[PDB]
Amino acid sequence: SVSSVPTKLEVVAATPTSLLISWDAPAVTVVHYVITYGETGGNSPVQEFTVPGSKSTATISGLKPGVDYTITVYTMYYSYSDLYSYSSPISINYRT
């Protein structure tokens, strides 16, 4: 009953085509984080990559200017009861 979900997910720096996001780590042993991003508008493909568990920021690049993106973060964490499992996502919206 300790949350594996990160908190306080926010954009801290933006260019027209890139974002710098940061989150607060959940109080568990995160192996890596999964970051996903797609255009909030409809059926654009959502893309993802990993960031190592020590890191708690991630740059997203290659975006289109003045487009609304949905950014989502969740964890691959070790817990005693679950071994390696995935947290639920935390999600923000941001417009380049």
């Binding site: 009953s1 300790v2 109080a27 568990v28 042993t29 995160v30 192996v31 890596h32 190592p52 568990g53 020590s54 070790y78 817990s79 005693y80 009861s81 071994l83 390696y84």
Partner: protein
């Protein structure tokens, strides 16, 4: 061997169960060194240290109890694998300082808890 087998299982079941209850309640409070899995090794390390000295002084104890206490309780109470994956997960999280710390504390801590339970009973007798 059937009576032996019952000692292993009873002692083990009491051990495994204790380790489970202690781990789910306490591990998540300090993930860098989960304290539930530490205490069950420090505890059974203490128990086996007392058993070391007491069995020696009681050459005539029924083996059923010795097997139930050591292979059973202590074998089921302690863990090498939970200690292992936590260190493995720390390593994969790149948290090496705590992977290494976790290894030292478990190893040197068990031996201490063993020497403790041994030299307590020694000195008592």
């Amino acid at each position: 061997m059937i009576k032996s087998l019952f000692a292993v299982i009873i002692g083990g079941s009491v051990g495994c169960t204790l380790r489970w209850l202690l781990s789910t309640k306490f591990n998540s409070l300090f993930p860098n060194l989960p304290p539930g899995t530490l205490v069950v090794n420090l505890l059974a390390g203490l128990i086996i240290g007392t058993a070391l000295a007491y069995f020696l002084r009681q050459p005539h104890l029924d083996p059923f109890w010795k097997l139930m206490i050591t292979t059973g309780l202590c074998g089921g109470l302690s863990t090498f694998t939970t200690f292992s994956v936590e260190v493995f997960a720390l390593l994969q999280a790149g948290n090496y300082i705590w992977a290494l710390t976790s290894v030292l504390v478990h190893v040197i801590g068990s031996l201490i808890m063993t020497a403790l339970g041994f030299f307590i009973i020694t000195i008592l007798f």
